[PDB]
Design a protein around this ligand. Structure first.
Ligand SMILES: CC(=O)CC(=O)SCCNC(=O)CCNC(=O)[C@H](O)C(C)(C)COP(=O)(O)OP(=O)(O)OC[C@H]1O[C@@H](n2cnc3c(N)ncnc32)[C@H](O)[C@@H]1OP(=O)(O)O
Ligand SMILES: CC(=O)CC(=O)SCCNC(=O)CCNC(=O)[C@H](O)C(C)(C)COP(=O)(O)OP(=O)(O)OC[C@H]1O[C@@H](n2cnc3c(N)ncnc32)[C@H](O)[C@@H]1OP(=O)(O)O
Ligand SMILES: NC(=O)c1ccc[n+]([C@@H]2O[C@H](COP(=O)([O-])OP(=O)(O)OC[C@H]3O[C@@H](n4cnc5c(N)ncnc54)[C@H](O)[C@@H]3O)[C@@H](O)[C@H]2O)c1
Ligand SMILES: NC(=O)c1ccc[n+]([C@@H]2O[C@H](COP(=O)([O-])OP(=O)(O)OC[C@H]3O[C@@H](n4cnc5c(N)ncnc54)[C@H](O)[C@@H]3O)[C@@H](O)[C@H]2O)c1
Lengths: 291, 291
């Protein structure tokens, strides 16, 4: 029954940076890992802009206390491009890299050799089966799903996924950690997309199809969902906010593992965008061009 | 270019009552129609209740303006059990009765004989093709879809659907009325479910199927979509709120039309609840039990 104090987040993108930000802000020492130094520089820079927004709103009467919160938080986030060494003595690895089983397995198979024994492994995968990733190691009793929601600083939900192999203690540690993060942990079964994505993705793909089918425009479909269903963001807005590349990988994956389910039919428009390197707010352009 | 001044709302259910409420709250003369005086008595009580909530918030710092707002609106909604006796001198008919093409056409075929020459006909149908309803009349150029969202007193959106026969004059008149209602009119083609329902319903069905499959409980699924995706309501809370009967009909219609589309595969649990007359909050019970 370990207590997560030292955390290693592999992946500094939309999710990693946020998970690192929250772990840091809530008193956990964090080491954010990524491929290059420029990437890490950008990530930590972004985490800073996110903290300032929080500061400028939370500490308007005492700005000096706001700078401390920001500095103290950024300070509790170390950067490194060497997962192998960092995990040597970490309490928990939270993998948030490209949505691709092969890559993720290769990653954990390696880290399984370098990481300490009490170390807990966790994937933030959207559509991959935890069991499938946990078996790329020999640490399945310490491997589980730990799913966050974009933007991590705002979304309160966290999905804690056990595999038939995950231990109760591993589970509890991830549950306590989740809480110490100020989130609302929810145990799910290891089913594709778990809960949210299994329902949310096919929907977003349906919005894309309704657009390709020529029945309406993205703008009207977005206004529709926001003003009619009360959603915070329209379908096309959310897609660009999540990342078209991540979205596409989630679908191709499901498509491949169930090629006769029309829900997961890849999209021509989605593939074209990702093929031209337009992934949304990520690259400044997706379905909508951003400033 | 007729100016909707007098409005005849047929059906005092979840929508109709709301639609009458808003029209009346905004200075239109309204007559709410339903099957029996008892039903009408109840619809009026619901509108009185909804109105007080609007008042306790749109006039929070002025009870007197609250009282006048409620009374003035209620006393502006006359009631009848036969719309044929009212439609010879009304500007617009907004139909909001059971989701069934036969019953709807039957209604408009009859009203088409009694209604004034200029009167416009509008259906608030969730999933039926406006063209299929307009054809029960010889008033096509004055027939269109004016789709509102539940609860009507709150949701800003209103889909104004034109068929290839609706005149520009009839369309424009409906747009003004929408704005007159304080809503945000959006022109949709006459496609099944139009925009919102074609994406929302299949989504809600997927939620049900994820539950029948045993993957997750109704409660975790609701908590998940709310906390993880920012949804105002979980899929089951929304199903009950909307009406399971209405949902079942919507799906059956699409299912009969596109029998091989798995998106519209009827739900055993949805059917059993409807068979036991558990339609949602309107009957005190659907997937959840209420007061
Ligand atoms: C089936 C089809 O054919 C087409 C369709 O309609 S699909 C269904 C579309 N509708 C949706 O998806 C509903 C989604 N849910 C929502 O957007 C929200 O839950 C909601 C608009 C119902 C309000 O819920 P909420 O945020 O929890 O509010 P609630 O706690 O219920 O009440 C508080 C507010 O809501 C309002 N409210 C709730 N029900 C109301 C009603 N029936 N009448 C007037 N006001 C109401 C109050 O005025 C109040 O305003 P304040 O914020 O100033 O206090
Ligand atoms: C793909 C998968 O595997 C799983 C998933 O993650 S699916 C995607 C899940 N996420 C969603 O569905 C996104 C839905 N969208 C939302 O709920 C909302 O749009 C939202 C939470 C992003 C906020 O949007 P919004 O209402 O427009 O707020 P915005 O105007 O953007 O900012 C206002 C608030 O949000 C916050 N905010 C937004 N982005 C932020 C960030 N990156 N960092 C810190 N705060 C942020 C601010 O704290 C701010 O607080 P104040 O109101 O006090 O000023
Ligand atoms: N996009 C979302 O909103 C969202 C929400 C929850 C979960 N997820 C899931 O979480 C994961 C994170 O996706 P993301 O949105 O943050 O994407 P992202 O593209 O923003 O970030 C991925 C990061 O991984 C890095 N990376 C790639 N290969 C690596 C490797 N071998 N070693 C170290 N770093 C590597 C990239 O340089 C990049 O910074 C995915 O599996 C995704 O399915 C995404
Ligand atoms: N439920 C929703 O949230 C929602 C939102 C938009 C549109 N719609 C659509 O609007 C219509 C209204 O549905 P609703 O939710 O208000 O349902 P409801 O069951 O609450 O109300 C329907 C009302 O119609 C009356 N009615 C039935 N047959 C009638 C007839 N032949 N003549 C006169 N009155 C009759 C009933 O007595 C009842 O009061 C349906 O076509 C539905 O698909 C529903």
């Amino acid at each position: 029954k370990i207590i997560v104090k030292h955390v290693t987040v592999i992946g500094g993108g939309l999710m990693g940076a946020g998970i690192a930000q929250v772990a840091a802000a809530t008193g956990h020492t964090v080491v954010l890992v990524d491929q290059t130094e420029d990437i890490l520089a950008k990530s930590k820079k972004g985490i800073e802009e996110s903290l300032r927004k929080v500061a400028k709103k939370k500490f308007a009467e005492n700005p000096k206390a706001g700078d401390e919160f920001v500095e103290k938080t950024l300070s509790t986030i170390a950067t490194s491009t060497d997962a192998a060494s960092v995990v040597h003595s970490t309490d928990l690895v939270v993998e948030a890299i490209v949505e691709n089983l092969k890559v993720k397995n290769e990653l954990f198979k390696r880290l399984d050799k370098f990481a300490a024994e009490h170390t807990i492994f966790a994937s933030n995968t959207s559509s991959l089966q935890i069991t499938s990733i946990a078996n790329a190691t020999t640490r399945q009793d310490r491997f589980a799903g730990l799913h966050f929601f974009n933007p991590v600083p705002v979304m309160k939900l966290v999905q804690v996924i056990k595999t038939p192999m995950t231990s109760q203690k591993t589970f509890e540690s991830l549950v306590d950690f989740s809480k110490a993060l100020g989130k609302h942990p929810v145990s799910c079964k290891d089913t594709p997309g778990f809960i949210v994505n299994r329902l949310l993705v096919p929907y977003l793909m349906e919005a894309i199809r309704l657009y390709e089918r020529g029945d309406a425009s993205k703008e009207d479909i977005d206004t529709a969902m926001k003003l009619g269903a009360g959603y915070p963001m329209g379908p096309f807005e959310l897609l660009d906010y999540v990342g078209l590349d991540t979205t596409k990988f989630i679908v191709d994956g499901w498509h491949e593992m169930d090629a006769e389910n029309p829900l997961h039919q890849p999209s021509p428009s989605l593939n074209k965008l990702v093929a031209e390197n337009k992934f949304g707010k990520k690259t400044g352009e997706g379905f909508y061009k951003y400033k």
